[PDB]
């Protein structure tokens, strides 16, 4: 038997992302922990050194009631041990099959807790791919706890992801089609099909023939049979929108009438001792949102007359341009051959004495030295395709902290 | 009395006043000045930080006061096209107007106190205050008396309400009551600008023949001449230059000497207006209580 | 290997969107993190270029606009 400190490892209970997960038992007190075992002999063989580094990085600073905690990470010259919180009951995937689906009472309660953790992850700029009922575990008090972050990735502002790593099911269409995405919308889609299994007991998109399965996904069609309450069907059609821009957001789910029904208030933001004052001041900020954020104007454009109170500091611009009456482009676009474009953008760069570095045939990392303050300002040029005969050159900005 | 609003403004930083998402316009100094004024109307903004591309730094502000100063200065009157405004860049006009009136750029750090912000506003006598990030060198927001008093009204429980808040203005002695700069109903717009130049006040209450207020010509209402491109005929009256709002202005915001300071402050943040016109029973203007006066009575109780 | 298809997120311009008339003229809706740092521009008219980008500071956002000859 191999022990870690005073934790003797016993019953193997984890498939892992590749590496076994066993139960740890405190030899002194019988306290149970969950240990993810990663021997250096296996991981080193691949290029997953940064992948599991990425997993540990994300999970290291997480602390949420419905996310499995990472207590410690111990290294030996032979293996690496991830010591996590142990919960008995296994996946809620086994909470199905057993029992008969779930009530609106029960399936919603779990969905609430699960979503709470998903929110927590996204708030920390951490998306979690492979978000399926097998990665959601239950404790003794039947509380859902999100588990395997092997395919997770930290979201960076101004940057999309791709990779496409999820399960055959539970994976958003933009993922299976190998298209780049922001992050959260992919997680929403996975949760959307989770809520289905919690209410139906089965999957919305399944097929033995896998190529015909990915077809069933990219087409936004699924059946909501018989008993299924109308209030939640509107949520499913929303969470499972093939168009990612019309797809529901967490904001759109928190305010959904089905999700509001009897949810604990301790989930989500609301609700040397200034912390009791800094948390009080924040509540007063979100209360009057009109002070920090611009609201959206009314939608109807068929109204004969529209009465409303205009801000005093925007009347002259208003009364002149509106009484009886420019678009912003993203970067620049052309219709030239894509590789012929890249040839000419470097010419322009060479013509300005810039330091450029090629990452992809359509992705540069150009650097300039400011001839006044001697400061290095960076930016990224990425070429895209818009039409069937039109390309888009995108200009991104790179900040550098030392 | 002394110390609760002082403590409040000394505890919070400028960063707290900054909206979670706002818009900031920046002009290059080599831009034509008339082009810039239209750009103000375009984005619905009063002022814009000035970027000297040669010096690689911000150098000041372009506000409505600049527009007023351009107009009063180079006003060949009136049918001959204004020439010194059509062909004139920002930098070239800062070589004329800013000279003999040099007001160097005054900014403030986001992590700097809200107290020093109000202090900087009064000490420098400026209505704008560019909150500039010390690192990166980015301008984040332009601070105003209006934004400060609003946040003040917003983020305080009046359980430890001070005494003076429930006291009148007559006893508190807040505001200006001597030599009130104001214009008649018939007063030419050009003459109003000249008052704006020598008195350097934020607004001019419009009085009738009896000396009673019937409207108000704020510095803000000047870009209407830039919005409607009616800036070439300054011969017209103030009341005609204020016709663009017309029936949609609901009246001039006033106050009395006998009503409490809290009454004045509350009324002043609901209106989102810079100053109130102090007035008696017969609507005769007798004073002006501005956001400048109020915030001065809070930093210095 | 073709250059990647442009993600629909970048096709939501906060400056092309119009704010409520009751709100402060300077305020903008909350942007998502993915539109940050990207450069936006107006149609080049006369001889003045109008560039734009949205940048974050801690948890505050600012959409800077620049007019340049």
């Amino acid at each position: 038997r191999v022990k870690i400190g005073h934790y003797i490892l016993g019953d193997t209970l984890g498939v892992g992302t590749f590496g076994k997960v066993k139960v740890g038992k405190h030899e002194l007190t019988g306290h149970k922990v969950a240990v993810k075992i990663l021997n250096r002999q296996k991981i080193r063989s691949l290029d997953v050194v940064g992948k599991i580094r990425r997993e540990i990085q994300n999970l290291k600073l997480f602390r949420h009631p419905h996310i499995i905690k990472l207590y410690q990470v111990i290294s030996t010259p032979s293996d690496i041990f991830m010591v996590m919180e142990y919960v008995s009951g296994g996946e809620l995937f086994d909470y199905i099959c057993k029992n008969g689906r779930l009530d609106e009472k029960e399936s919603r309660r779990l969905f609430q807790q699960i979503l709470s953790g998903v929110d927590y992850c996204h708030r920390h700029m951490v998306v979690h791919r492979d978000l399926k009922p097998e990665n959601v575990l239950l404790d003794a008090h039947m509380n859902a706890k999100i588990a395997d972050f092997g395919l997770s990735n930290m979201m960076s502002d101004g940057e999309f992801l791709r990779t496409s790593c999820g399960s055959p099911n539970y994976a958003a269409p933009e993922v299976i089609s190998g298209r780049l995405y922001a992050g959260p919308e992919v997680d929403i889609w996975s949760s959307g099909v989770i809520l289905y299994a919690l209410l139906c007991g089965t999957l919305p998109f399944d097929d033995d023939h896998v190529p015909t399965l990915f077809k069933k996904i990219c087409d936004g069609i699924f059946y909501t049979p018989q008993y299924l309450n109308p209030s939640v069907i509107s949520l499913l059609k929303h969470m499972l929108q093939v168009d990612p821009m019309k797809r529901a957001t967490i904001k759109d789910i928190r305010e959904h009438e089905w999700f509001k029904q009897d949810l604990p208030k301790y989930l989500f933001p609301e609700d040397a001792v200034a912390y009791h004052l800094i948390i009080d001041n924040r509540r007063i900020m979100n209360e009057a949102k009109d002070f920090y954020l611009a609201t959206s104007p009314p939608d109807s454009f068929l109204d004969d007359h529209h009465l409303t109170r205009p801000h005093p500091e925007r009347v002259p611009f208003l009364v002149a341009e509106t009484p009886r009456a420019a678009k912003w482009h993203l970067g620049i676009r052309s219709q030239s051959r894509p590789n012929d474009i890249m040839a000419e953008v470097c010419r322009a760069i060479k013509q300005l004495d810039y330091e450029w570095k090629v990452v992809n045939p359509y992705y540069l990392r150009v650097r300039r030295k400011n001839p006044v303050t001697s400061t290095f300002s960076k930016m990224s040029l990425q070429l895209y395709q818009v039409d069937s005969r039109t390309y888009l050159l995108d200009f991104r900005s790179i900040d550098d902290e030392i | 009395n002394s110390s609760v609003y002082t403590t409040f403004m000394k505890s919070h930083r400028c960063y707290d006043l900054i909206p979670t998402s706002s818009k900031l316009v920046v002009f290059d100094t080599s831009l034509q000045v008339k082009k810039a004024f239209f750009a103000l109307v375009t984005n619905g903004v009063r002022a814009a930080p000035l970027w000297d591309s040669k010096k690689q730094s911000f150098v000041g502000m372009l506000t409505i006061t600049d527009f007023i100063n351009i107009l009063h200065r180079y006003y060949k009157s009136a049918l001959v096209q204004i020439y010194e405004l059509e062909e004139h860049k920002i930098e070239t006009w800062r070589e004329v107007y800013l000279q003999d009136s040099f007001k160097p750029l005054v900014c403030i750090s986001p992590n700097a106190s809200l107290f020093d912000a109000v202090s900087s506003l009064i000490r420098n006598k400026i209505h704008r205050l560019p909150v500039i990030d010390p690192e990166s060198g980015n301008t984040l927001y332009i601070l105003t008396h209006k934004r400060i008093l609003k946040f003040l009204k917003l983020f305080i429980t009046e359980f430890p309400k001070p005494e003076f808040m429930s006291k009148s203005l007559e006893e508190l002695q807040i505001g200006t009551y001597a030599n009130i700069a104001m214009v008649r109903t018939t007063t030419p717009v050009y003459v109003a600008l000249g008052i704006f130049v020598q008195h350097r006040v934020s607004a001019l209450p419009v009085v009738d023949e009896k000396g009673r207020v019937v409207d108000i010509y704020s510095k803000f209402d000047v870009i209407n001449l830039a919005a409607e491109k009616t800036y070439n005929n300054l011969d017209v009256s103030v009341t005609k230059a204020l016709q663009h709002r017309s029936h949609y202005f609901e009246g001039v915001l006033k106050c009395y000497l006998h009503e409490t300071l809290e009454a004045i402050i509350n009324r002043l943040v609901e209106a989102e207006v810079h100053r109130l016109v102090v007035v008696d029973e017969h609507d005769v203007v007798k004073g002006i209580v501005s956001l400048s006066d109020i915030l001065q009575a809070l930093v210095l109780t | 290997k073709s250059p990647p298809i442009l993600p629909p997120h970048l096709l939501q311009v906060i400056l092309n969107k119009d704010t409520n008339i009751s709100c402060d003229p300077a305020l903008l809706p909350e942007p998502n993190h993915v539109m940050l740092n990207h450069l936006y521009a107006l149609s080049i008219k006369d001889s003045v270029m109008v560039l734009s980008a949205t940048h974050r500071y801690k948890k505050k956002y600012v959409t800077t606009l620049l007019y340049k000859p």
């Binding site: 620049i332 000419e344 953008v345 010419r347 322009a348 760069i349 013509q351 300005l352 300039r368 400011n370 006044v372 303050t373 400061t375 300002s377 930016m379 050159l393 200009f395 900005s397 900040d399 | 920046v26 970027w51 591309s53 690689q56 730094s57 911000f58 990166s136 060198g137 980015n138 301008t139 | 450069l39 521009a41 080049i44 270029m49 560039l51 980008a53 940048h55 800077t64 620049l66 340049k68």
Partner: peptide
């Protein structure tokens, strides 16, 4: 010591000046 954001704009302008026709 100069705005990082404006410098980013300043740089983009120099590039587009050549590219745009």
């Amino acid at each position: 010591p100069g705005s990082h954001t404006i410098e980013f704009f300043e740089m983009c302008a120099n590039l587009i000046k050549i590219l745009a026709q």
